[model samples]
Target: SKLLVVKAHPLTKEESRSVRALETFLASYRETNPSDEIEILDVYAPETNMPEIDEELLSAWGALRAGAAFETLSENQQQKVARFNELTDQFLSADKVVIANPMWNLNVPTRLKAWVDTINVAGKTFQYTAEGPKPLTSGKKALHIQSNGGFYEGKDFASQYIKAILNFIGVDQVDGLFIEGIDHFPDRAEELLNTAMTKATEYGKTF
Candidate 1:
């Protein structure tokens, strides 16, 4: 299976427990599925060039919907729209997806949100039917690995949002691995991180 691992944290594994746990999970996954193809997308990387939902994109889409030729769109519009479609296509090509992020302000990082916007395009990931919106990318699965300083119980927006969006796009088999309480229980930080890593390793084997 083709696995797309989207890394949203800006820090290195040495600096961030979330990043470290994700790396551990990925390493175990690779070991278990050596023949499977894995691709890493670091959203915060300098060369990522993630497109946003901006005026240029909206205008480009508008023109295209009005039957304008792609070549007739402005340079910025064309570039942004094309890049957006590329991201959507890349997402559709993946059989499995892994979202690795650290909880920031109770939500996902800005770059990761932008990446999600790029892929969650109309008519690509989902469509509006007469009854309601329907997902196009079925038969895919996803996993989210998030680390939080405090346990939010069910209040963690990062994981909830990821899972919600994945479900919206027809990826129903979404799983979550959260590393929590490092800051809330500072004395047990190491233990919590270690336990999360062990769980990630076990999850990787079957994922």
Candidate 2:
């Protein structure tokens, strides 16, 4: 099986309990599934460029034209279409996708959202039907490794949005690991991290 790990954590090192737990979980996962192929995509990488609004509009227009005008467009415009397709294909081909997101301002990273935009291309991951938009990317599983500084519990919009989008695209077998309250409980941060890591490892073993 092909595994895709979408890492949105910006810090170079652990720097936080959630990151450490994510690392621990990934390591534990490696132990259990050594033969499965794994690929990691960092949304914050230097070479990565999120599409601008104009680019997105152009890509959408191009897709509406079914690539007839897309090929004749400028190189940058053409590449935008190609890039979104590549990302969409990446998501489609993955048997499992694990997303590592640290809650920012009670939501997901801006970059991660942009990355999601790339994958959520119309007519690629989904399509418009008489009933409404139907998902084209199905039969896959997803897991989100989430970490937050405060306590919002189930109210985290970031987690809910990710979960909703996954189901919207027909990836129904989804789950998440949330590590929160580190800042409030600074004294017990390590202990809490240890507990979260243990849980992450357990989930990773079978997830």
Candidate 3:
């Protein structure tokens, strides 16, 4: 039952309830599965913004400069961000990463995307090899925690976006847990989340 829950939401009452419920569920699971480890990484709620230099573009410059990433960042900011990236990679390398993100404007909020753009880098998160780009990280599973107000008849672009990006990044498998129509029916939101959590507890590995 060792797990790492990467939640991309802060403590707003409405948004955090699902995160809280998820935390509870994982703890409960560990009661029986005592040997399991659970680690929670709140990338969004964390107190810093960690952006990275595009190594491809940066190498062309021959040296790091006060560009967007550095100009907009302080010394501590730079160091902290680097540390975040290192830790993120460390965790993903070791355990299953469950990405919990509530849908906003038909997609995940900006913070989550920022994390993606920063982490999805070359030679670190992934690498270039013989035939094409290869995601070096493997043997990991991803559970996408998604909740929205309406249902899509099939896998829509939003859902597909998660699948495609993760697949490209080298995660072996990913499963989506969607809770739609919740804005319209708040009561059902709980039931839906409860159900989704049960499924997450089962297995979801995305490639």
Candidate 4:
């Protein structure tokens, strides 16, 4: 199976608890699943060229929906659309996905959200039906590793939103690992990190 690991945090693994946990998980996963193909997508990486819904893309989509030929679109529009589709297709091809990010202002980073937008395409991940929006992709699972400075007691929207959006795209088995209270409970920061890393290690073998 192809596993896509999406890294949305900008901090180094040594500096970021969430990223370190993800690394631990991946290390264990790789050791156990040596035959599985693993692809790491760093959203903040310059070469990634992560696309967002902008004016050019919006215009390109509108024109295409209006029966305009792809060749007629502007060069910039074509490039953006192509890259968007490439990212979406990559997501579709993955049998399992893992998103690693830190909670920023009660939610995920903007770049992560942009990555989500790039994958949530109509007629690809989901389609609008007469009854409602129907999911197109299936038989996939996803896992999210989020680190929060403070404990929100389920009030945080980061994991909730990720799970909801993944479910919308038919990734029903969405799992989450949240490393919380690192800042609020400074005295127990190491304990918290260790606990999360241990859990992540265990999840790696079975994920």
Measured against the true structure, the TM-scores of the candidates, in listed sequence, are: 0.96, 0.90, 0.72, 0.96
Whole-model lDDT values for every prediction:
0.88, 0.79, 0.61, 0.91
Best TM-score among the predictions, by candidate number: 4
Worst 10 residues of 4 by lDDT: 149-158
- Please list the residue runs of candidate 1 whose C-alpha ends up more than 4 Å from where it truly belongs after superposition: none
Off by over 4 Å in 3: 12-17, 46-81, 186-194, 197-207
Clash number for each model: 0, 0, 13, 0
CA shift of 89, model 4, Å: 0.5
Model 4 lDDT on a 0 to 1 scale: 0.91
Residue 122 Cα positional deviation in candidate 1, in Å, after optimal superposition:
2.1
**Colliding residue pairs in candidate 4:** none
Give the higher-lDDT candidate: 2 or 3: 2
Q: How high a TM-score does candidate 1 get? A: 0.96
RMSD of every prediction: 1.2, 2.1, 5.2, 1.1
Model 3, 1-100: lDDT tens per residue?
3466767776643546446445544555566567756676666654544444455334423324434644456565556555656765755554566676
**Model 1, total clashes:** 0
Assess the local accuracy of residue 122 in candidate 1 as a C-alpha lDDT between 0 and 100: 77
Rank order by TM-score, top first? 4, 1, 2, 3
